[PDB]
Backbone:
C-alpha cells in the first residue's frame, strides 16, 4: 500500500497524481473538458464530463505506471470551488449543468440580496461578498429554473454538491454525501463560525435543507471507493479541500500570516490567519483553511477570476499563440506593451472590485500595436491583478510580505514571474514542484490514515527553484500600475443589468 | 479637332489619378500612380511637391496615351485634390521652400491648443466653419513661415506663394501664369471667410500670414487658364467633387466615401449651417457649379482599421478578407472595437482618445473581433450622421456611398441596418472624377447642364434595412458606451 | 442486468478510442485519447506500449462513465487496432523489452533490402500476401531480437512474447491469461501464411524468430476471453471480436461480399476490396490480405494505401501556409475552374501502393506565369483522388473487377468537391454513408455476432443508409486525358532521393 | 539653352523605365512603371502595345517633371528594350492588329517544329546566329499574319508595319515619321543576316513575311530622328536591352563578359569584330563596339529570373512588398533538398526546350514556404552556372570573376550563392540602371555629348565583391541535384 493519489478536479481539466512515501510524484495524468458558454458571461460544465474525465485520469495514472489499485493507501480530493451541481439521488442524473464559479448569471439574484440589506449578515456569518461567484445563488437559480424541483428537494429526491461532493458521491456509489469545511465555506450557505449550515441563508435563497451534504474536517476518512473492486482492498477517501486551500496547505502555510499566490485558471492569494477569522475591510474574503494538524483555521483571500484562462483564450479562441510557440515567446519579442493594457474581466471582476458587470477590455491601441504587445499585456494583467489583491491583503492583515510564495503551472513562465517581481517590488520565490494543490490534497489524505505522522515530516520537501528580484524602480513601477488602474476603471460596469 | 472628352485629375493623399470621360460620362481610361508618404517623425506627414506634380503630369499623359487620345480631343481639364495639404514655394523658380505638409500631419498641435486657449473657438467656427485642429492649412503655413528663416519677409516681398494642391497643380500646369484656388479648397484653409467669400483678415493676423502669398479665389466651374492648349475649367476639393459626382446638389442630399477614412458630406443648399454637434461647415457646389454649403464629418480610421488587422494583428489578407470572417459569425458576441488609433475625429475631436476593445468574454474569437472591426466603420459613420441630422434637422431617407469598401455587401447591409437608412451604391464608382469633369464641362459648354446626366445615372444596388434594424438603438447604445471609454486615454 | 451495449476499442496510430453502441448500432458514446509519437531518429517511429495501454484503458472507463453505463450492461467488447505495429514483452512481468515499433517505422529498410536481394519477393508475396517493405511486423521483431542481446534464447524459453496491438491489449486485459490474434492482424506480420492459415515456417527461419513467442491465431469473431474493468468481485465481460483497423472499417461498411470496396480518407488513404473466400495474387503493386465474411469467417481482400492524402492539406496549412485551416481547402480550390495544368504529387515519404518506391519525393509540375495559389491548393486536393485512382486501377487489373460503387469514410468525405472529383476521375459512383464510425462499428459487429447480440448482419444491412451518392460527371475521354498527365507527373517524382 | 542631360528609355518586359543623367553620367532621376502581363492560355505571354507605349511615355514625362528638366536641356534620347517581342500594326492609324507577342511566349513551338523538320537548323545558325525556338521574332510575325485574315495582302500594300519594341516606340514617338531598328535588335528577329548585315530573304520567304512591313536597319549610335516631348529632341541611340547592358558595363573589347539579372537573366561576352559559332547551345548575336559600331557577342539567355520572384509575390502571395524574397530565403540555411526549375516559359539556353514547364522537386513534409522561396532564388544562380559553363566551352575563356549588375534582382543573398555555386568571385558595381546607361552612352556619342567612352571608363564605380563560401565537393553535389531536376522538367507539354 505504497502510494497516495490526489484527484485535482480543475476548472479546465481533471488531474490525477500518484505520490510515494517520500512525497515524490511518481505519475501524473490530465484530461481537458469542455467549457460551455450558453451565452456571453455564462459558464457551464457537464457534470458527467467532470466525472468521466476525473474517473478516467485516475485509471490512466495507475495504468501508465503499472500501479495496481491495492497499492493505494488513500485518496485525497481537491477541486475547483463554488461550482454547483444539483442531481437526482436515485438515478445520479444532474438536473442542470454544473454552474461554474465563473458564471455571472445570478447577478440579478445578487442585486436582490444587496437590496434586502444582507451585505453585513453575509460577511459576518459566511465571510463572503455578495457576488455571483458563490454557490448559494446558483442553487437558487437551478431550483427556480427546474419546475417542481423545490418540492422534490423537500421530498429528499435531489442532492446539491460542490465538485468535491459530486465526486465523492459518484466514487462511493452514493453511500457518501459529504463536503469539507473549506468547500462548504464558499457556498454562502454555511456559517464559518458555528460550523454549520446557516438557516437564514437557506431561508433567504429558498433552498431545502434536505439537499445538503454533511460537512467535515478536511483530514478524515469519509469513505471507500471500490477501485480495487467491491471485493477488493479498501481504498479510503480521506482528504478533501477546496483547491486553493489545499495549495495553502501544501505550501505549509499553516501558521498565521503565512501566504501564497496560486497561478491557475484564475489567481488566488490566501493568507492563513490561524484559529481567528479576520474581517476584510479592503474587499477580500474570509474563508476556512486547514490547520497544521487538519483542524479548522481561517484565511484571508483574494480571488482573481482570470489568469491562466486568459492565456487559454489567446490560444484557443484568438489563436494568437500555440504549444510550439507560447505566450512567453511572443511576449518577450517586444520590450514593452507599447501602451497597451488588457483588463481580463471575461467573467466580471473579482477581488477587490467585485463587479459582475465588468467585461474584458483592451486599451491603448495604436496603429503600431501588434499581437506581441497584446500577448505581453495579457500576461502583465496577471501580475497587475495580483498587486491589486496583495495591496488589499496587506491592508487587511497588517502584514507586509518580504517575499511572494507562488505556485501553479504559470509560474514556469519566467517573464511573468520577473514582471510580477518588478511590479510589486517584492521578490518572488518559485518552487521546483509547481502543482502544490495536489500535494496538499495528498498530505491531508495521507495524514488522515497515518501514512505520514505529521506535516513537519513534509517540511523539507519543497525547493525554491528560483528567486526573482525586482528590476525596476519605484517610479516606473508606480507609473505602470497607475495606468492599470486607469484601464480597470474603464472596464467596470459594462454589462447592462437584468 | 472635335472635342469629345473631358479629363479629370484627382491628386489624392497616396496616389495621383487621371480619368478620361466622354459626353455620356462613360469612363474611358483611368491611370493611378502612387507616391511617397514621408514621415519625418511620429505624427508628422509630408509629401514632395515635385513628386505630386510628376505623378499627376505623368498619369495625365498615360491615360491619354493608352486610349489613343490626343489633346485636340480634350474639351477641358477638371482638377480635384486632397485638401488642406499645404505647399509654400518660390514664385520665381517654382521651387518649394519646404515639403507639402499633408492634411494628416499633427505637427501644429501646440499652436492649435493656444488658439483655443486664447478663446478663439467661436470666431474660427463662425467665420471659417472649422474646428481648431492641425488638420487645416493655416497653422501649417505659419509653421513653414516660422521654420524657414527669412520667408515671411520674402512672402511680404511677393517672392513666395501659398497653395493647396489644386493651386500648386494649376500653377505648374500654366507655367506660373495662374495662381488660383476655388471656394471649396479655400474654405479648408482656416484663412478664408466662408460668409464674405474672402480671405479673413483676423486669421491672417493671428497666424501671421502675409496676404501677398495667397491666390485668387474663384468658382469651382470657370475657365481658369490653359495648358499645352487645353482649358482648365474645374476645381473642387476631392470630397466636394465626390458629393458633386454623386449629384448631391440639393439641400439634404448626402454621401459617404469609404476609404482609409470616411468622409461624409451633406449639401445644405445656399445657407451655411453652423455646427453645434462637432462637424465642419464647408463650401460645396450647387447644380450649376455655384457656391453652396455642406456639413462634413470625417472618420479618420475606417479602412485603416482592417489594415491593422492585416499587418499588425496579421489576422487577415487578400485570400482571407475581412468579409470572409465577419460573416462566419451572426454577430460580434457583444464585442465593440473603437479604432481610435490616432484619437477621434468628428464629431468628437479628441486627440487623446486611443483605440480600445470592449465586451470580451471567454467564448469571443478572432472572427467576432474581425467582424466588430468592420462594424466600427458603420458605427463611426452613424456617429457622424447623427451629428449632421442634429445640426441640420434633416433626417436622411437614403445615403449615397462610394469608395472601395462599398463592394463589401456585409458592410453595406450592416450600415443600412445600423442607420435605418437606405444605402445607394452607384453603377459608376468614379464619383470624384465625375464631379471634377462635370465642373470643368459645365464651364466650357460640353454639357449645358446636369439634367440628362441625372436622368441617366444608375444605382447599382440599394440596400434597405432588414429586420435586424429594430435592434439598432440597443446596438448603438453599446457603441457610444465604448467610445466614451476610449476617450481621453492619453496622458497630456 | 440486461446487456444492452457493445463496446469497440479502437487503438489507433495517434490515439486510443472507445465507442459504445446499442442494438440498433446507434453511437451512444465516444471517447478519444492522444498519446505520444516517439521519433528517435529520422525515419524512426515508436510508441510506448504502456501509453497505448493506459490511454486505451482510460478511454474505455471514460466512455462508460460519461454515458452512465455500467460494466454489467455490456454484452461484448470488440477490439481493433493500428496494424503491423510490433511489441515484444516479458511474459512474467508484462514489461516491454523495447518500445512498440510502429507500422510507420522505416528502421528495417536494410533487412528488407537483403530479403529482396536474396530473391524472396515471390515467396513472400505468394505466402504472406505482402510486399517486402519496413511496413510489416516480421523485420521489426527481428530488429528487436537483434537489438536486445540474449532475447532470442529467452524467447525460445517462452519468456518473451510477440504481439501486434490487438494481442498486447487483450493480454493486458486478461491479466496475461490470453495471448491471441486474429487472422486479419496476423496476415500483416509477414510471418503468417495466408493460405495455410498458420505461421510460416520459412519466414520464421529466414527472420530467426522463435515460434515460442507467437500467439494463437483465431477468427475475427469468437469469444477469446474475459476482461474485468471493475476489479476484484467485478463483472467479467466477454472479449469477442478482433480485426485490424482497415479490415474492421471494411466490415463496418458492410463490404462483406466479393467486389465490395471502401476507401478511408485520413492523413493517408486505405483502400480495400473484398475478394470473397479466394485470395487474389497481385501483379500490380497491391497487398493481398485477410478480411471478414458475412458471419465473421475468413475472406480475403486486395489492399493499397496512399500514405500522403490528408497530410498534403496539412502541409499547405502548416508549412506552406497557403490556408489557415484544412477545412478551407474546398473554398479556395473552387475559386478556380481548374488547376491551369498543374499537378501536385505529394510523395513526401516516398510512394506506397501501387509503386512502393521509398525514394520518390514530392513534386509539382505544369507551372506557368499565371499559376496561382488556388491552382496549387486545388491540385493538392485533386492528388488525393489521383492517388486513389492509381490503387483502384491496380485493383481492377489484379481482380478483373470493375467496381459498381466505392464506399467512403473519414473526415475528407465531407469535402464534396473532393468526393465529386473522386467520382469523376474514377468513372465510379462514390457512396458516403450516414455512419461515420465504421471502424468501431465493424469491431462491434464482429463482437456482437460472437455472443449473439446480433444473429446476423441482415437487418444492419437493411437499415443501412447512404447519405450521399456521387455519380461521375465527366466522360471517359476527359477523365483519361487528365489522368494521363497525372501518371506523367508521378513518373517524374520517382526515384528522386539518392 | 545648354543641353546638359541625356535621357534613356528602358522599356523592359515587366516595366517601362526612364532615366535622366548628366554629363558625368550621374543619374539625376529615375521612374519605373509596371504593366500587365497577359496570359491568354498557359504557355502564352502577351503585352498590350498601347500599355507599353503609355507606361514608357508617362515615365519619360515623370522623370523630367520630377527633376524639373525642360526639353531644351536634353542633348539626346537613347532607346533600349525587351528584345524579340513582336508587334504588327496599321501604318495609317497606329493600331496594333494583335497584342505584342512576348519573347517568352511559347505559342510558335509548332511553327518551329516545321523549321526544324525542314532541316533549317544549320542555315539559321550560320546566317542569324540563332537557335530554332519560339523565342525569336520571325515565327511570331508568321503567327500574327496567319491569324489575321487579309494581313499579308495589307502588308504588301504597305498598310501594316512590323517592329520590335525599339521600333514601335520610335515610331510612336515620331508620329510615324521614322520606322527603324538597330543591328542588335534586328539580329534577334531571325529575319536578319548577321554577316551580310541585311534582311535574309530565305527566312522571309520561308515564314512568308512581306518585305514591305520591315523597318530600316541602322547603327545603334546614330541620329534617327527627333521627338517633340517644344523643341525636338534627337533620338540617337538604340540597342536591345542586354546589348545595352553589355555596353553600359563597358564590355567593349573581346572577351569581356557580364550577366544581367532582370525578368530573365542574360550572360553576354563581346567577341569584337568576329562572330564566334556556339557549339554548346548559345547564341551568336550583334553587339556594340567602342564607338557604337557593329561587334559580335556570345549570349546565354535564361527566360525566368526576376519573373520567378514576381510569381512568388503576385500569384502565390508567398512574399510581399514589405517582406521580400531575401528576407524569407535567409530564414533557412538551405532548401531542405528542394529544387525549383523555373521553366514557366520553356527552357532557354543551353537547353532550348519549349515544352518544358516549371517544376518543383524534393518535397518532404518539413519543406516550408521559406525553403521554396530560397530555392526559387537559387535557380537563378543554377541557370547562370549552366550558361557560364557553355560560354567557357564556346569562348575558351575561363572567367576569374563574374561581373553582374547592381539592379534589384542581384541581391546580396543571390550574389553570395551565385559565387558559392560557381566557385568564382562575383563583382557587383553599385550601378542601378546599367541597361539605361548603355543606351545613354550610345545616344550621347551620336550627338557628341561625349566624344568617346574614355572618361566614362575612368569613372570609379563602387564595386562589391563576393567570394566563394563553400568547397568543391558541396558545390558539385548541389549542382548535380540541379541537373537532375532540370532533366525531369524537360519535355513536359504535349505538342499541338
Ligand atoms: Cl463508503
Ligand atoms: Cl493660362
Ligand atoms: Cl480470460
Ligand atoms: Cl523625326
Ligand atoms: Mg494485489
Residues:
Amino acid at each position: 500500500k505504497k502510494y497516495i493519489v490526489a484527484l485535482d478536479q480543475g476548472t479546465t481539466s481533471s488531474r490525477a497524481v500518484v505520490m510515494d512515501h517520500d512525497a515524490n510524484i511518481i505519475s501524473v495524468s490530465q484530461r481537458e473538458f469542455e467549457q460551455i458558454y450558453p451565452k456571453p458571461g455564462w459558464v457551464e460544465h457537464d457534470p458527467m464530463e467532470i466525472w468521466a474525465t476525473q474517473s478516467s485520469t485516475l485509471v490512466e495514472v495507475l495504468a501508465k505506471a503499472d500501479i495496481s489499485s491495492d497499492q493505494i493507501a488513500a485518496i485525497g480530493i481537491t477541486n475547483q470551488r463554488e461550482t454547483t451541481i444539483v442531481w437526482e439521488k436515485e438515478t445520479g442524473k444532474p438536473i442542470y449543468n454544473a454552474i461554474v464559479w465563473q458564471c455571472r448569471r445570478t447577478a440579478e439574484i445578487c442585486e436582490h440580496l444587496k437590496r434586502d440589506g444582507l451585505e453585513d449578515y453575509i460577511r459576518s456569518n459566511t465571510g463572503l461578498v455578495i457576488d455571483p461567484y458563490f454557490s448559494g445563488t446558483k442553487v437558487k437559480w437551478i431550483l427556480d429554473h427546474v419546475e417542481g424541483s423545490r418540492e422534490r428537494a423537500r421530498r429528499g429526491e435531489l442532492l446539491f454538491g460542490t465538485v468535491d461532493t459530486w465526486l465523492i458521491w459518484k466514487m462511493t456509489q452514493g453511500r457518501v454525501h459529504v463536503t469539507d469545511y473549506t468547500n462548504a465555506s464558499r457556498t454562502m450557505l454555511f456559517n464559518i463560525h458555528t460550523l454549520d449550515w446557516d438557516d437564514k441563508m437557506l431561508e433567504v435563497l429558498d433552498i431545502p435543507r434536505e439537499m445538503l451534504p454533511e460537512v467535515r474536517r478536511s483530514s478524515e476518512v469519509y469513505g471507500q471507493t471500490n477501485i480495487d473492486g467491491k471485493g477488493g482492498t479498501r481504498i479510503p477517501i480521506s482528504g478533501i479541500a477546496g483547491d486553493q486551500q489545499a495549495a495553502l496547505f501544501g505550501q505549509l502555510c499553516v501558521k498565521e500570516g503565512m501566504a501564497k499566490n496560486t497561478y491557475g485558471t484564475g489567481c488566488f492569494m490566501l493568507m492563513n490567519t490561524g484559529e481567528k477569522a479576520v474581517k476584510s475591510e479592503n474587499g477580500l474574503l474570509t474563508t476556512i483553511a486547514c490547520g497544521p494538524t487538519g483542524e479548522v483555521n481561517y484565511a484571508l483571500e483574494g480571488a482573481v477570476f482570470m489568469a491562466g484562462a486568459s492565456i487559454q483564450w489567446l490560444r484557443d479562441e484568438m489563436k494568437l499563440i500555440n504549444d510550439a510557440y507560447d505566450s512567453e515567446y511572443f511576449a518577450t519579442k517586444v520590450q514593452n506593451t507599447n501602451g497597451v493594457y488588457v483588463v481580463p474581466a471575461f467573467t466580471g471582476l473579482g477581488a477587490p472590485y467585485w463587479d459582475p458587470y465588468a467585461r474584458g477590455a483592451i486599451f491603448g491601441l495604436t496603429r503600431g500595436v501588434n499581437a506581441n504587445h497584446i500577448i505581453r499585456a495579457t500576461l502583465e494583467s496577471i501580475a497587475y491583478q495580483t498587486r491589486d489583491v496583495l495591496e488589499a491583503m496587506q491592508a487587511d492583515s497588517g502584514i507586509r510580505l518580504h517575499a511572494l510564495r507562488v505556485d501553479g503551472g504559470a509560474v514556469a513562465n519566467n517573464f511573468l514571474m520577473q514582471f510580477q517581481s518588478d511590479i510589486l517590488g517584492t521578490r518572488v520565490e518559485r518552487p521546483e514542484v509547481r502543482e502544490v494543490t495536489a500535494l496538499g490534497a495528498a498530505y491531508l489524505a495521507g495524514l488522515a490514515v497515518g501514512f505520514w505522522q505529521n506535516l513537519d515530516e513534509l517540511q523539507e520537501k519543497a525547493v525554491i527553484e528560483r528567486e526573482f528580484r525586482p528590476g525596476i524602480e519605484t517610479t516606473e513601477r508606480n507609473y505602470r500600475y497607475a495606468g492599470w488602474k486607469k484601464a480597470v476603471k474603464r472596464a467596470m460596469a459594462w454589462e447592462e443589468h437584468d
About this structure: The domain at 1-253 of chain C is CATH 3.30.420.40 (Nucleotidyltransferase; domain 5). The CA atoms of residues 84 and 217 of chain C lie 15 Å apart. Chain C touches chain D at residues 308, 311, 315, 319-322, 340-341, 346-349, 361-373, 376, 488, 492-493, 496 (CB under 8 Å). The pocket of chloride ion (ligand 2) is lined by residues B 174, 177-178, 225-226 (CB under 6 Å).
